[PDB]
Amino acid sequence: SRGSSAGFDRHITIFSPEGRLYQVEYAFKAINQGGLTSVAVRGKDCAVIVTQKKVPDKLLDSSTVTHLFKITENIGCVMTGMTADSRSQVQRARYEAANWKYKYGYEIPVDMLCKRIADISQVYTQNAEMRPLGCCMILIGIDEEQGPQVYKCDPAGYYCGFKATAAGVKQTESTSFLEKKVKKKQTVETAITCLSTVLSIDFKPSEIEVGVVTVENPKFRILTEAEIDAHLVALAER
Amino acid sequence: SRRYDSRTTIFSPEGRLYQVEYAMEAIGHAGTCLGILANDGVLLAAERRNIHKLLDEVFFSEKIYKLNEDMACSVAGITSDANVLTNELRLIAQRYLLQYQEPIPCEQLVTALCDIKQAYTQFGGKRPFGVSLLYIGWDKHYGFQLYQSDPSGNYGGWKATCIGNNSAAAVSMLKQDYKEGEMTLKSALALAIKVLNKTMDVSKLSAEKVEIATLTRENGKTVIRVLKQKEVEQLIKKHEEEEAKAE
Amino acid sequence: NQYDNDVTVWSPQGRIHQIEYAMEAVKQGSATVGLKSKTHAVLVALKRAQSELAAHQKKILHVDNHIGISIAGLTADARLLCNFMRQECLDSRFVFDRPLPVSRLVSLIGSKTQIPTQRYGRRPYGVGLLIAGYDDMGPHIFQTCPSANYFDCRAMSIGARSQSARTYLERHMSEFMECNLNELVKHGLRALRETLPAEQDLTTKNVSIGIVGKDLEFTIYDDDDVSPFLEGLEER
Amino acid sequence: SYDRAITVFSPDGHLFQVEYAQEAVKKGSTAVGVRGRDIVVLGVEKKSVAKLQDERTVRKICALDDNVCMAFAGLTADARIVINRARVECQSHRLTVEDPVTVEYITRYIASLKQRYTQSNGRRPFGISALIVGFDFDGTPRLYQTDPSGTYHAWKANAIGRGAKSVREFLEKNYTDEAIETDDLTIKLVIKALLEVVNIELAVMRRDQSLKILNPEEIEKYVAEIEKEKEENE
Amino acid sequence: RGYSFSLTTFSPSGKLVQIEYALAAVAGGAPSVGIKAANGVVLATEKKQKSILYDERSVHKVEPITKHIGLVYSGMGPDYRVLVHRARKLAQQYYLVYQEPIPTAQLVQRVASVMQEYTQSGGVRPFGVSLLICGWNEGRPYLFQSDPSGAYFAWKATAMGKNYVNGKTFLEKRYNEDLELEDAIHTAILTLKESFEGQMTEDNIEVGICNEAGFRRLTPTEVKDYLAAI
Amino acid sequence: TGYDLSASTFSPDGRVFQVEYAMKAVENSSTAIGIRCKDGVVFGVEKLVLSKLYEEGSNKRLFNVDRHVGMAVAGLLADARSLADIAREEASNFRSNFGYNIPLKHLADRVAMYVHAYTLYSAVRPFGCSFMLGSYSVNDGAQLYMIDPSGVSYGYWGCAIGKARQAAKTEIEKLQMKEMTCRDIVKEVAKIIYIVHDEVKDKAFELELSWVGELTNGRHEIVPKDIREEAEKYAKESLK
Amino acid sequence: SIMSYNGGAVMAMKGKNCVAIAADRRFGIQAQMVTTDFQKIFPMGDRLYIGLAGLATDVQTVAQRLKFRLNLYELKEGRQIKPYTLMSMVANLLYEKRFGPYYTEPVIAGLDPKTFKPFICSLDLIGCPMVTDDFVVSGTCAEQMYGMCESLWEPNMDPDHLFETISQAMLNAVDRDAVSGMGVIVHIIEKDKITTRTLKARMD
Amino acid sequence: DRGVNTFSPEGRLFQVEYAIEAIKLGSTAIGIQTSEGVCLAVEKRITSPLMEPSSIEKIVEIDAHIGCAMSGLIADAKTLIDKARVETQNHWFTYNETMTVESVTQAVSNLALQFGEEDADPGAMSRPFGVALLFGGVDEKGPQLFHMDPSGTFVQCDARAIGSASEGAQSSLQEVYHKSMTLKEAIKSSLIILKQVMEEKLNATNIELATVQPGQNFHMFTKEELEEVIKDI
Ligand SMILES: [K+]
Ligand SMILES: [Mg+2]
Ligand SMILES: [Mg+2]
Questions:
Q1: How is A89-104 classified by DSSP, letter by letter?
Q2: Ramachandran sector of residue E219 (left: φ over 0; alpha: ψ -120 to 50; beta: rest)
Q3: Is the CATH number 2.60.120.260 carried by domain C1-236?
Q4: Looking at CA atoms only, how far is residue B91 from chain G in angstroms?
Q5: Domain H1-233 has CATH 3.60.20.10
Q6: How far is H12 from chain C (nearest CA, A)?
Q7: Angle, nearest 10°, between helix axes H166-176 and H183-197?
């Protein structure tokens, strides 16, 4: 015990002598290979997702570089990690949500969608023939009774609802920032401030992406550059 | 895929089935379990391992399973594996009864299960079941019977036998004290307590720590009873009384 | 070693050793030559005899009236592939009442042979083909490989010591398009003869010829029927 | 379903899983068969003795049909499977041809079963050999043997199991017209052959008369009658 | 089409080490406690609650299976969720055939049997969880545990997860068979306090109860009240 | 590595080396480029001639996958051809189910998910190819997507794949492609291919050119012979 | 009609801490009597019986298939099946064959194995259950049986009066049905004993 | 450890090369093709006098006009022989004619390489067949002998030996073989050569011989007919 290994416990999802799944732990490291960080926060009126938009090239069509995804018209999502894995998990989420609506006659609750994706991830932690997906999904939406929601699930199949949360390279630093801020008794401002602190950047409007849902306007919306700029300008004048 | 495959159902270089042998080591460590054939009945006597703690005592026994009206069994080895096999025994017994409208002869039930166990050692690449079983019963072909099966899918009929902890030592004791053609349920019960008193190295043997079931005939009908704790204490006492005359 | 047994394991150099090893099967087969003119496609092949009393191995197989093949590598894989090709040609005549175009047949071989290069426990086909055909686009010589790749050729040679044939074919290929048929076969035979040890010669026992074109359904020539092509005899 | 090749060739042409199955046979109880003139006999070593065992439940000699039976050496569980499959097949033959099987027919069936398990994905070979005996419709007595490879042959007499080497050496020198002229001697030839390595279960099949098993009082008659003769021979 | 071969096999000493290693995941899991009272059953567990950022009410560890049966675990949460879904599905299948709620013992047998499958079936690992299952049927309370091997046991009281050996000796010198449910809740919470670290609130433990009225979770405000006196 | 034998195994640093090794097969391939402009997309490929016995045209690396979509490939050619068949089937089925030409973005995403599925399992290996998809229509404009062996898919103004990738990208970055036309860009695609071609290390190549734009009425087509030759001549003379 | 091919009749009836179940004894094929001791009531428990009328082959098959299921249930559970639970088990077995049914319409009579409360029910051939507090009938003379039961049945009958009523209901019913009768068997089920009688009955 | 369909660096399938090594452990068999018929002769290789020599069959009738001699792992040969039998009867059923020797050989040889472990239908073949075969028969091409090995390569042969002593036996066959050779000369030649290469002293019970002739159906020689030919020694 303490970093012990037997057999194939570093290669497939079997228990190590301590009771660990090294392959799952390695899927968490795969999340940081993308090099990006994402933050999400929930208020009484709205929920917001902000993530980095790195476009080093500019031979890229930057409209197609995004980690923000519409799942349904009322459910939005930010993906952190391996891109192709992420895209696949987005398809599955879309499929699960459409199917729920078809069978049950009402939009999937965000908590249920997250749970479902987590339960699917769980299968890859217990069956030896496939790897976990090296990605993390954060979902936002409005619930009719509970208000705005942010949910996250991970490659271990854990999931939770959050007041605010983060994913990727600066997760632990964003968590600390949000902890000290939430400890006291504006949601888009907090999210972009958190991200800008932990990266020490101070953004241009083309270097982030922002997604929102609000109690008034529950349709998932992606902000334009101009709309983001207006928030960046409003913060700059303290 | 080839890389990860244990290869559970292949021969070793000396013609051996390693997974079977290792299962048999698991059984060697499990709670001791014996059966004794008498003229007027059959018994099973087993060490309890669910013994005790803050445990609740909810079922009629821990390791004695009724299989049908005329048959019971006991198990030594992996408990969950035993639950799969005993459940399957019950099913085999009811399939026979459906088809013939008479009870499955004891040996046929054992054989049917042993074919399943054998198959797990020859195809499929799975681990075998880590279980040995003692079976007691009555049928109209051979009357009172006792059988033993093990993880290879091998079996045999016995007048007395033991599986589990200190088996070799128990079979010694039985070879000497067991009277072929001349045992009663009362003398076999005394012999059972004698052997369990030797083989449980957990020194001063107790009723809380053993289970006995008897199988007899009464009015053309098979009776299967798990002795209550008052009967088990009373028999331990008669074995403690009996040790002296020996002095 | 940990990268050379499975067709599903990429090496660190971006190679698949099982495919390369399948390609060695074809380098070890006896040589064959494929070439074409404006009007004909011809195959020429060296046949090996396991002993003096054995018959020489077939290297040239009929596929349809307008297609034949020459093989190098595992014979059993050659037969399985040739049977596949035959079937696709029959299907096409069944459905459309016209010959399957040669480039479409070659595509079908590519798809079919690529499949096992990507699945665990499967293996490449260990055979390389030269394919002679004639259709509306005229004569063709294609080459197929164990990698599932294929090539459209002015001429080609595969198998043992085929590099010598290739070198002859390059030297004279600017002549091929306007050769009459005898000239073209003479060219094939000379290219094939270059693969032979200095002592060894082309005989009626060891040469097999395949011809298709504008005037002629795919026809195979063995034994006494190759004699007209061998005399002939330019060399020295 | 388990598609692993289990029996494969090794570099010098060996099928090692089959050779290992053969090692399982060599650690089994010795079994002997002799083809007499108008009788056929099979006998087999101890098992364990063990005073507490029900003798009936561990016989290593088994009826396949009225006119064919077998003994085996090797893995007993594997043998039970082969035995039941052959029994099923005897009844199919009876069904579709309205004759009992020849001893050869069923020997051939058992052998091809065994051969299949050496050339099929997910299965190890059967760890047994079998001696198969009986009589055809025309009265000719028969002794056949099968092994894990699916090879089969006819024998005048033979052994399999532990110490088959020496027991076969004994039979080679001792099988003569004189030792099989009568039934008593044929039966004795088997018991002497076993006493060479060996208790002893034994059974006989007379032309038409179906399978008789002996009988521990009738057996130790022959035991003492050979044991005292191998003391005079010292 | 899967890996068909087992991933749990016997070692030379007769151990199934993938199960032993599953048990190690259980032993490093958060603590759980079950106590069978005379007139009820209590299940309690520690919520490993890092960060004030979690919404504590969003996911639960103590779960209803039916109106009369509930669950808690120690070990890996996502594995537990699988088993909660199967137990629920098993409970309904039973109800559809028999039109009677599934007896606690029957539910445990069926769930244990699913756990057994994952010790033998191709290409999978066992579950890294032990379950505690409470229920009320035949006018009487039940408490069961089911382990990664698929073995189950009926308990009067027990503990699992981190520090369980001590939890069990604590309960041993504290449980009696004639104890009421409100008192058993108190001692369950005390058993967790033995191995807590951090100071308890009603937002980082979870408690479920089972009696004649059925199974339910205690609310934050009910737990807060029991936490006065602790 | 430990660790690099199966796409179902993560390394301890969170990498999937079988996918990286497939990427290496592409990075050993000769270079293909795509450029999106004002009124279409143009593709060019450096096609190495491994033998003068091959026909001028053989081993095409530019494919029509629908009447409005071209595909440009680098890497293991049999894997690339099989991917062109998947793309073709996807576009064909799209038209059958929904009744119109598949939007390029949607075809790229669908084919990328297929490529992605070969990166999770021991049962299969990753594709050893990267490919670009190009189209033009009046409604959607010019679009150029690129997909690699991990199954990642992005839209581009300009793109290069294969061994002189980086060298090609720096030349492409010098173009104001947004304001230029296909008839102009062909010359520049040919020019860039001749620049990044290592004429010492691997002599002799054929240039392969195709386009899709207003000037082809939204059909993907080979660049005509006379225009290819003028672009070759421009490229060659710009080098000297 | 498929249900009149073999004929037959069963009924059950509730009393004070007791139940009764009865059946005719004829096995016949259309007009022909084959046997006069054919069993239609099967014990499912010490105090719990199922009577089946309908096509004789399915009477037997349903009884045997049900017993299979009950035997497993009792082995696996702690215990003897409750009446209401046997009803559900039968319902379930019949509705599995919803689109190719067994041609049998059972009645169940018993006492709870703990509380000894009386229980009766019947089911149709696809497993619709009907529980009543008085009586249930099934067979080719259902109308005849309803006439008798509806006129004779009273509440809270002791074992003796229950016997006379169920017997008179059956005997007079089947005597107006050509393909039921050739004898009647009656089981009275009490807490402490089972009483089984055959009745003196018309044999035409 | 590696799968049954792995290529070696030299471009051969390991399992097939290894199956070819198993043929070298088999008894020697000889075939000779003459204008008067073909003959097949095989060393039985008796391992004990207790064994019935006639229960060793290594030459088998395929159809009336075709025999088969085998060497290697004999049990493996059964499924191949059955398949040859069934194919010739299927051909007769459909076309009302006899199947050519070359066609029968071809059909059997198409089973060689049909083994594997993930494509895989039943529990279909897990490995190649450890057998070589000589098919000798008569069709309208005249008398004909073909050889097949575990690779699925098959070829016509004027004379051929297989099994342990085949190098030596083949060398002796090159020496004696001529095209105008009679069948009775070919029979004597093959017995002469088996005598040399066998570890046991040749006699009428430890070899088998069969012919197929234009006039005549497949014929296994009797003890008595063997004794006649053995006299010349
Ligand atoms: K996995
Ligand atoms: Mg009537
Ligand atoms: Mg009448």
A1: HHHHHHHHHHHHHHHH
A2: beta
A3: no
A4: 7
A5: yes
A6: 6
A7: 150
